[PDB]
Amino acid sequence: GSKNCPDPELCRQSFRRFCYQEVSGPQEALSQLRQLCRQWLQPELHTKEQILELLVMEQFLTILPEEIQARVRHRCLMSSKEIVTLVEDFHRASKKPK
Amino acid sequence: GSKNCPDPELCRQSFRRFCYQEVSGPQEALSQLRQLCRQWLQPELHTKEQILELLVMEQFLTILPEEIQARVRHRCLMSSKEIVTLVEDFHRASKKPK
């Protein structure tokens, strides 16, 4: 089985694709995005290590095709290594993605 | 020799979607990113302050029309103030920009 998944990702892509709207002001742009940004990583001690893996991650799949989006869409993803794994056996192989 | 080497967040706005293009392998993906990302934020006694303002910007740019990054740099980014500045002028300027 598989359902739900409490973790930072929605608010991430949310504020990531805010697009001028929510705030109708200038400084209000980064204002709202700022609140999300903080809620994106919201590091309480995690150095630039976690952050690095933050942007690195989002981009990790961003670079990948819709393959990862297909596995995630139908639910399957769980580990970054796993994701890249599928993309590997994908752009590398050509068979049932396991 | 007093160089300048202008580079606010080019490698950043460039890394954004490095593109899989199979960098020899899967993990290789992060390799490239982790590199850009790493240099994107880069540690330097900069707590979540820089990290935050980091995503805040990248977003403030992704939300704003390149026209901003142009009206500021004319082909890149410079200062979030200058960006939101030009935007403010478009919303309801009042006095010529700096």
From Swiss-Prot, chains A, B:
Signal peptide: none
Subcellular location: Nucleus
Residue ranges the record marks as coiled coil: none
A single Gene Ontology CC term: chromatin
Claim: Nuclease is one of the keywords in the record: no
Summary of the tissues where the protein is detected: Expressed in a variety of organs, but most strongly in adult testis and ovary followed by small intestine, colon, prostate, thymus, spleen, pancreas, skeletal muscle, heart, brain and kidney. Also expressed in umbilical vein endothelial cells, foreskin fibroblast and Hep-G2 cells.
GO biological process: negative regulation of DNA-templated transcription; negative regulation of transcription by RNA polymerase II; regulation of transcription by RNA polymerase II
Subunit structure: Homodimer.
Role, per record: Transcriptional repressor.
UniProt name for this protein: Zinc finger protein 174
Organism: Homo sapiens (Human)
Gene name of this polypeptide: ZNF174
